[PDB]
Scaffold this active site. Sequence first.
Site, mmCIF file in Angstrom:
data_model
loop_
_atom_site.group_PDB
_atom_site.id
_atom_site.type_symbol
_atom_site.label_atom_id
_atom_site.label_comp_id
_atom_site.label_asym_id
_atom_site.label_seq_id
_atom_site.Cartn_x
_atom_site.Cartn_y
_atom_site.Cartn_z
ATOM 1 N N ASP A 105 81.416 52.305 9.563
ATOM 2 C CA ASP A 105 82.747 52.771 9.918
ATOM 3 C C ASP A 105 82.930 54.225 9.496
ATOM 4 O O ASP A 105 82.243 54.730 8.604
ATOM 5 C CB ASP A 105 83.815 51.891 9.266
HETATM 6 C C1 LIG Z 1 95.195 54.863 -7.308
HETATM 7 C C2 LIG Z 1 95.381 55.070 -5.806
HETATM 8 C C3 LIG Z 1 96.515 56.062 -5.561
HETATM 9 C C4 LIG Z 1 96.934 56.007 -4.095
HETATM 10 C C5 LIG Z 1 97.208 54.558 -3.698
HETATM 11 C C6 LIG Z 1 97.559 54.500 -2.214
HETATM 12 C C7 LIG Z 1 97.313 53.090 -1.685
HETATM 13 C C8 LIG Z 1 97.732 53.022 -0.219
HETATM 14 C C9 LIG Z 1 97.009 54.112 0.569
HETATM 15 C C10 LIG Z 1 97.872 54.543 1.751
HETATM 16 C C11 LIG Z 1 98.116 53.345 2.664
HETATM 17 C C12 LIG Z 1 98.355 53.840 4.088
HETATM 18 O O1 LIG Z 1 98.605 53.063 4.946
HETATM 19 S S1 LIG Z 1 98.259 55.617 4.453
HETATM 20 C C13 LIG Z 1 97.010 55.925 5.735
HETATM 21 C C14 LIG Z 1 97.356 55.125 6.988
HETATM 22 N N1 LIG Z 1 96.531 55.572 8.093
HETATM 23 C C15 LIG Z 1 95.955 54.587 8.988
HETATM 24 O O2 LIG Z 1 96.161 53.437 8.803
HETATM 25 C C16 LIG Z 1 95.080 55.030 10.158
HETATM 26 C C17 LIG Z 1 94.991 53.906 11.189
HETATM 27 N N2 LIG Z 1 93.601 53.517 11.344
HETATM 28 C C18 LIG Z 1 92.659 54.365 12.054
HETATM 29 O O3 LIG Z 1 93.020 55.388 12.533
HETATM 30 C C19 LIG Z 1 91.199 53.934 12.196
HETATM 31 O O4 LIG Z 1 91.146 52.629 12.703
HETATM 32 C C20 LIG Z 1 90.490 53.982 10.842
HETATM 33 C C21 LIG Z 1 90.705 52.672 10.088
HETATM 34 C C22 LIG Z 1 91.033 55.137 10.002
HETATM 35 C C23 LIG Z 1 88.994 54.194 11.057
HETATM 36 O O5 LIG Z 1 88.521 53.321 12.042
HETATM 37 P P1 LIG Z 1 87.686 53.950 13.318
HETATM 38 O O6 LIG Z 1 87.028 55.244 12.902
HETATM 39 O O7 LIG Z 1 86.629 52.968 13.764
HETATM 40 O O8 LIG Z 1 88.640 54.217 14.457
#
Ligand SMILES: CCCCCCCCCCCC(=O)SCCNC(=O)CCNC(=O)[C@H](O)C(C)(C)COP(=O)(O)O
Lengths: 63, 157, 83, 63, 385, 185, 169, 108, 324
Positions: free
Chosen positions: C39
């Site tokens: 991935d």
């Molecule tokens: C101690 C830690 C501190 C921070 C803690 C934070 C914990 C939560 C983190 C933020 C949670 C969120 O949702 S913030 C980030 C949210 N962004 C997304 O969910 C993007 C949607 N997914 C896609 O674009 C693709 O499927 C992808 C899976 C990227 C790749 O797969 P491919 O390339 O096959 O396409």
Amino acid sequence: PLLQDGPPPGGFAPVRYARRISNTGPSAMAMFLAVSGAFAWGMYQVGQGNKIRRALKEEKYAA
Amino acid sequence: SKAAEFVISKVDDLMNWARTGSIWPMTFGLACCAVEMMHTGAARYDLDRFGIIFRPSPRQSDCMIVAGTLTNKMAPALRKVYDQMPEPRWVISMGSCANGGGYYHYSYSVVRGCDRIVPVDIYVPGCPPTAEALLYGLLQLQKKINRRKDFLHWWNK
Amino acid sequence: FLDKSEVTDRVLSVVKNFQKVDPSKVTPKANFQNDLGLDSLDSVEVVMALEEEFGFEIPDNEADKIQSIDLAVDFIASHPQAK
Amino acid sequence: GATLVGVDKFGNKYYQKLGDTQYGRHRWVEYASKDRYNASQVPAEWHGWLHFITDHTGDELLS
Amino acid sequence: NFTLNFGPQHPAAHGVLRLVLEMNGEVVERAEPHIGLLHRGTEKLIEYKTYLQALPYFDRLDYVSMMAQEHAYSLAVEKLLNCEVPLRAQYIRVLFCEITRILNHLLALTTHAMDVGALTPFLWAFEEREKLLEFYERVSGARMHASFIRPGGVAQDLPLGLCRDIDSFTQQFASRIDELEEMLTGNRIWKQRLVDIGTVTAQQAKDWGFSGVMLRGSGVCWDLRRAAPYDVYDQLDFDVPVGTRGDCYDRYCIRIEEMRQSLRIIVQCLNQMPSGMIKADDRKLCPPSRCRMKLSMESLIHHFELYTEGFSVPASSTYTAVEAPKGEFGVFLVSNGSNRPYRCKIRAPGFAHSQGLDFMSKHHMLADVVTIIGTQDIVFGEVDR
Amino acid sequence: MDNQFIFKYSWETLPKKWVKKMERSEHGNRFDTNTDYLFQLLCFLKLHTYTRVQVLIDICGVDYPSRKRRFEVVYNLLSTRYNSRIRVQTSADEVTRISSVVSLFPSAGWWEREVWDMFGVSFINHPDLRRILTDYGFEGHPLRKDFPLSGYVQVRYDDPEKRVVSEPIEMTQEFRYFDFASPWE
Amino acid sequence: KEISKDWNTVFERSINTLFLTEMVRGLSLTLKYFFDPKVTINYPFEKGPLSPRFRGEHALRRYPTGEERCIACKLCEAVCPAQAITIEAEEREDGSRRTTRYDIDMTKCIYCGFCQEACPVDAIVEGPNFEFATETHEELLYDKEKLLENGDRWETEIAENLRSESLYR
Amino acid sequence: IGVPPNSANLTEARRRVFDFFRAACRSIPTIMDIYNLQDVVAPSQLRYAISAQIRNNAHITDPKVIDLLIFKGMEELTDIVDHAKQRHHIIGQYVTDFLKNFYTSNYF
Amino acid sequence: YIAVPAEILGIILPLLLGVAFLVLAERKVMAFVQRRKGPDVVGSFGLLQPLADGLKLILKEPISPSSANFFLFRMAPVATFMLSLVAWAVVPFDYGMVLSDLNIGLLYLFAISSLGVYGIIIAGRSSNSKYAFLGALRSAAQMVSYEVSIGLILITVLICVGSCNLSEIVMAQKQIWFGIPLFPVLVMFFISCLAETNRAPFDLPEAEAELVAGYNVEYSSMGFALFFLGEYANMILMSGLCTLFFLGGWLPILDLPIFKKIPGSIWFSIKVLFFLFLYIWVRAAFPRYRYDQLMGLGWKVFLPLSLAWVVSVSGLLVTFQWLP
Ligand SMILES: CCCCCCCCCCCC(=O)SCCNC(=O)CCNC(=O)[C@H](O)C(C)(C)COP(=O)(O)O
Ligand SMILES: CCCCCCCCCCCCCCCCCCCC(=O)O[C@H](COC(=O)CCCCCCCCCCCCCC)COP(=O)(O)OCCN
Ligand code: SF4
Ligand code: SF4
Ligand code: SF4
């Protein structure tokens, strides 16, 4: 009830709000003169007392 | 052991008198109840007459007066400051907000009572309590301290 | 620089802990997102592990340049900080 | 003691002093008991007089 | 550089104050206050309660000027309702607003002096403050949180003996102010602890929203009760003090002069107060007399329907602002058209003043931070609604 | 200056595309503009000679859960020199970011932070935009009409771990909502 | 260029800033109050002044005959901004509308007097008592028997307070 | 610095996702040694936890929603970096059936 | 030669109880200045209040981890307390009412006062804190700075009497006190003693040390109280020094041979308590003084001026041959 609270006839007495200054204590060179004269007279008295003490000590030594 | 019982009674009375004649509350006022509790320490309803003087630190304070609303962000600080206190460690909950909810009592960021964070001994209710009400609450706390046979309990145990 | 043996060992050993890889699939030339079926998040995770075992880091502009073992381990063997 | 104003069924006695223009030492209580007296012994009839709520003595308030 | 933090428990910092500031060893470079420790949630709670049930929230916002916030809320409701107010109610509202100004100025000055190190004026100012807290305790029940000012007029009429006692107090209040001022203005320590501290320019105060004493300290003659006089203020004559260079000392002198002006205004209201009704005859936002609700059917119906449902403000939205002792206190009501406010945002003057602490405490020493805190008179009830 | 004079002059002087909606009344002159022209309109009102709006009173926010642009941020302004009060408001959304005005009025930073805290409306190129009022770790934006009055979580002291912990809310007495609304209104 | 350059005035200023004239003048003021009578009051024996309108203890009055004034109209519960009053009612076999549970949470109460001024029968009042100071939280949940006990205790003074200020409002 | 304006396309959204994940990793040791926890949890598993949390919202399609989610991610990360979150909050937060529900309550 | 310890205890115990009652007097006088009563309930006029305070302090758990080498933190109170007591072994109360009869007894006092700086320094250092130590160091610098003004004023006094012995200094004041001529010098000495004990408007160093920290250090229950006891003993000592040097030590103030019933032991005590009352008055009459201007004041208005006073006294005495 036809007996509302209010000022008495003729109004209230006039008041002051203009920061009256008392101006108490000695002024100008009064304190300076009172200190300088006291210093001079006290120094003369100290000299006289030192003379008396010297006389007492010298008579003690003469004994 | 009846002969010594007089000695334990006198020692207990002396200890309670010492702890009651000199209470050093720690001001934790954080809302409008702090203003009334500040008037209580003022010239009129003198607290210093009863041996009550406020301390700026919890390490040298007898009791703690929680006066004002206790939000969610401040409750950990209140608990932490309460932890750094000596053995007697009495707590007075002045005002309606401190002693259980308050005028708000329904909020995302209000602790419904300082008794959910620290154990409270005297509840002084009012919004805000009068200086006479706070004085009566402190007198009630003094009366509560008198009912302490701590040396006798140590002897019996 | 660094010898090819140690860097190849360090890049082919840490790659075995991704809960999907197979021992028969890992080799000095087996592309991440194509041969391994990796991935994009897993790809940045692998390059992250390459920069996690040591204190150096790969800058932002050098992140997705080469997502393959060959030139990545060449970079590893051309890193002055690595030993 | 300038003036003694009434007594109570509990035994606590009520005094009164009249000032000139500034408040202070107007009316107070001498509690009958001594076991810390609970700071609350004034009955309802005498509670208003003590706090300057009403000018009635309290014995008059009972009637 | 190290970043130590404040939070003293004694009332020097007015409590509930958390201050994380970075210093250069001795000189502070940036102070970042952490507000929110007193966010009760009034703004969310107002929406759930009738226009009358929400009035006492405004006592709990700025709890040294309790009748100043009630004034703003009542004026907002009246502006939304288009309700006229009798002259006696306006005069007594002005009188009690001036009393709040005196109370707040006294408390601010003496907490500031306590922060600096002076202890005596604090006790003298409180033995003065009790004589007005008892005035509050006479017209209504509570000494501090007096719900005396209602949207229509006021809650209930003044007692018979209140005016004589207020005049008697005002006879000697000026001499008491002079006695307090004797130990501070002429004192050389007071000058050296305030002069050239926390200088704010008029342009910069305007940029940072420093309406209030912090604005007039910078030389801007901006008074909300002169620019936009709301209640009976055109009839009353008073002067607006303006500082020459605003740095923790012209603000103090301005506060002294505003105390004296409040005394003058109180005297004028006492002399000029007329007789008449105190609550408007609209009877949609004012309750009937207790002798009328028990004799007249319509009066009882109105009492029943306004002490449960309350009055329904027509659907609109207004912003009102009054010259609170801290500064410009503004209430922005959005009316849904029902009996409950849709949104009531409260513009606390202390918010902007506490925001402006960062630049005011630039390149100062640590001991020149408590004086900045004191000189702006911040209370965290209003800052954290 | 007179309230109607501001009305006439500003409406004539302003570019026409900036103001979508505008209102004149005794309550206050209102300029409802688009979300992207807000910065330019504020800059014009700040610097123009006749309309010298130098101080920003506050940045408000109203939640209308019945329209496509749910939120509505309100900018109360004041012209100290000319003694006038203008009000500019725009429409926002849960995900739409609206340009900040901290560059013009530095005091707007805290108001924008609290608007983000209460309504969750992000601001473009705002330095240090984070929650200011609610506690640390707070979930949800309290001032939305969706947020329950009592919230979702509680606070208490737990003895097994010597710290203050959080639980889902458990009210001893529920908030009794009294429905006083009546017909014929 | 702030200037005070005059031969006579330089001497006058340089003495005031050298002999602490301002300090002495501010010092002699405190000594004036040292000998002045104090303003404090010994609280347990002498109480501070109050008003007939004071807002203190809640009480449930009753008619001189002996029937309680509360008719379960529930205006006090509806007007209470703090939502501290809870009321339960039912029709007694006498047919009179009366309360069975009328409890006030004095920890939620804000002592505003809205409940007192909403009664059409003057059933509930706020007596002059301000000395609750209970040692237990659940003692502060008054439960219609504490209310009636307070009403019986303070009736002779609540009646006087009400009749004194009945001309108002 | 200031808040980024927006993302017009999903490629910028993916770029921002990767940048946020990278920054969270570069901030993983400071949160390891600021809360005084070394042997209780290894730094490796927090990476998998963050990856799972990011992959949770895989079905999102609107770029604006992605941007706001990422902004909330930085907000949470920055809150954790400072000594502001309560102790061990992070470790607790970041770690047939019908009869089972029936025997407990009617509301399942 | 076994009589000494009785005298030592007779000097020590009244000093401790006098310190307690001086704290009580501080509270009571500040109350009266602010139109209050102060501690009145306990005892008769508050006279039993210090006893209740002491018994309360003893009956509390001691917070004594000390988080350090366990030695330097327990020796600082001992050092400051022993120094503030040994400074009392040379005071000539009336005539034979003196414990030690040092032929210098004044440079000795200067040395003892100067040595009372290490206690607070090692208290701050041993107390492992990044601001408490710094505040203690600023306080030490303040005391060190005002020591030179104290010494110059002592030289001014010593020029007139001609001998270092403390008893002879009072003996030399039969004619006049030395306070009448040296009234500016008396004011300077009072201000220097006031600023050298952190018991004045000259107080801010320690005041901010608790405001920004809250004393979140190893705060012993009453082991810390030895600093407070030593500071108040130093208060009493430097109150008595002014009435030894500038006022008559035990001589009647303005007296004809009529009020001779009273002894000279109370002529000293009345002046000492007058100076203590002045201490409390000055504290509750003035605002605190910043450390930025504290150092500048103490270095730029007292050292040159006291040096000028030394020069003027010496020159005037030499010119007219008025030396001892
Ligand atoms: C101690 C830690 C501190 C921070 C803690 C934070 C914990 C939560 C983190 C933020 C949670 C969120 O949702 S913030 C980030 C949210 N962004 C997304 O969910 C993007 C949607 N997914 C896609 O674009 C693709 O499927 C992808 C899976 C990227 C790749 O797969 P491919 O390339 O096959 O396409
Ligand atoms: C009756 C028995 C009473 C016994 C007790 C003695 C009286 C004590 C009274 C004390 C009351 C005040 C206490 C306040 C303590 C803090 C005050 C310090 C303020 C201070 O230091 O001011 C400085 C001047 O003080 C000084 O200069 C003070 C020294 C005085 C100098 C001498 C003055 C007259 C000299 C004439 C000599 C005559 C003889 C010549 C032959 C300079 O203040 P600043 O900061 O504004 O200056 C600008 C330079 N940066
Ligand atoms: S009890 Fe009343 S006065 Fe006290 S903090 Fe709560 S709301 Fe404010
Ligand atoms: S308003 Fe009065 S009569 Fe009606 S339910 Fe309440 S207490 Fe009873
Ligand atoms: S005083 Fe106010 S809050 Fe208390 S019960 Fe009555 S109406 Fe409710």
